[PDB]
Design an enzyme around this catalytic site. Structure first.
Site: not given
Ligand code: ZXQ
Length: 262
Positions: A40, A138
Site C-alpha cells: 500500500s 493483485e
Molecule cells: B495495504 O498494504 O495497506 C495495508 C495497511 C497499511 O497501510 O499498512 C492493509 C490493506 C490495504 C493494502 N493491503 C492489502 O490489500 C492486502 C491486505 C493485508 C491485510 C488485510 S488486506
C-alpha cells in the site's frame, strides 16, 4: 551494517533501509537499492500524482467520482462507509493515504491512467526505479524475485523528499501532501514508534499480507531542526511468514542512530 544484519536475521527475512538527514547531508543505507514490494505504500505517491495533476486542472480535487459495490474490493473501509454520501477525488486521496483504502486507490489509479499512469508520474520526477504494474489487490502478491509493483528504499526516500520538501509539487499541493501524510492512521507502530513523541511525522505504510512483506516511509521533523526522510521495507522467503511492525520500528531506530540523530 552489522546491526541491520542481526535484525533481519532475527526477523528471518530481508530488510531494506535508506535514510537522509536533509540538514547534515548524512545518509544510512542497507540493501537500499534492492527491490521490495510496495504494497500500500504506493498510495502516498498516488496522492502526490493526483495533486500534481490538480495544479493544471481546476476542479479536479472536487470532482465527484462514481462508484458502487462493484468497485469495493477488500479493505475499502472509507469508500464503503461513504458510498451513500458520495466522494470526491480529494476525499478518495485522503482515504487512500490515511486509511489505506483499496477502492479509493483503484478509483484514483483509473483517473490517472492506471498503474502505468502512476509509474509515468514517478518517471517525470526522476524516479527510474519505481514500478506499479497491477491494481488492488493483485499488486500485493509479493512473490520473491518478482519485480512487479516494487521499488527500492533509496528511490522511495528520494522521491518522497522531492515531493514533500523539494520542488516536484507546487507549494500548496506540497503542503497538502505533507498534511495527508501527517494524518496517517496506520503507522503508529512503525517509523513513528521510533520517533520522540513531540517530533512531527508524516508517513505511509504498506502491508501485503504475505511473504512477511511490509514497509513504511516517512518525513520526520526533529524540533527546531531540519527534517529526516527515510524508508524501511521488509520481505521474507515463505508465503506464510509474518511481517513484523517491531522490526520496522527497530530498523528506523537504527537508521536514526546511524545518522547521529537523537
Ligand atoms: B495495504 O498494504 O495497506 C495495508 C495497511 C497499511 O497501510 O499498512 C492493509 C490493506 C490495504 C493494502 N493491503 C492489502 O490489500 C492486502 C491486505 C493485508 C491485510 C488485510 S488486506
Amino acid at each position: 551494517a552489522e546491526p541491520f544484519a542481526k535484525l533481519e536475521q532475527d526477523f528471518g527475512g530481508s530488510i531494506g533501509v535508506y535514510a537522509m538527514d536533509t540538514g547534515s547531508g548524512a545518509t544510512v543505507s542497507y540493501r537500499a537499492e534492492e527491490r521490495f514490494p510496495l504494497c500500500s505504500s504506493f498510495k502516498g505517491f498516488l496522492a502526490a500524482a493526483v495533486l500534481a495533476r490538480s495544479q493544471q486542472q481546476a476542479g479536479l480535487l472536487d470532482t465527484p467520482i462514481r462508484y458502487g459495490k462493484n468497485a469495493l474490493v477488500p479493505w475499502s473501509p472509507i469508500s464503503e462507509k461513504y458510498l451513500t454520501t458520495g466522494m470526491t477525488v480529494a476525499e478518495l486521496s485522503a482515504a487512500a493515504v490515511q486509511y489505506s483504502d483499496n477502492a479509493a486507490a483503484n478509483l484514483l489509479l483509473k483517473e490517472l491512467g492506471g498503474p502505468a499512469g502512476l509509474t509515468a508520474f514517478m518517471r517525470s520526477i526522476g524516479d527510474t526505479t519505481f514500478r506499479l504494474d497491477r491494481w488492488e489487490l493483485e499488486l500485493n502478491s509479493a512473490i520473491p524475485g518478482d519485480a512487479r509493483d516494487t521499488s527500492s528504499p533509496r528511490a522511495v526516500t528520494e522521491s518522497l523528499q522531492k515531493l514533500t520538501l523539494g520542488s516536484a509539487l507546487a507549494a500548496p499541493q506540497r503542503q497538502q501532501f505533507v498534511d495527508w501524510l501527517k494524518g496517517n492512521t496506520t503507522g503508529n507502530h512503525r517509523i513513528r514508534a521510533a520517533v520522540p513523541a513531540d517530533w512531527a511525522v508524516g508517513d505511509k505504510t504498506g502491508t501485503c499480507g504475505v511473504y512477511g512483506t511490509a514497509n513504511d516511509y516517512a518525513v520526520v521533523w526533529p524540533t527546531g531542526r531540519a527534517p529526516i526522510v527515510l524508508a524501511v521495507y521488509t520481505r521474507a522467503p515463505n508465503k506464510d511468514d509474518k511481517h513484523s511492525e517491531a522490526v520496522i520500528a527497530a530498523a528506523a531506530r537504527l537508521a536514526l542512530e546511524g545518522l547521529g540523530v537523537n
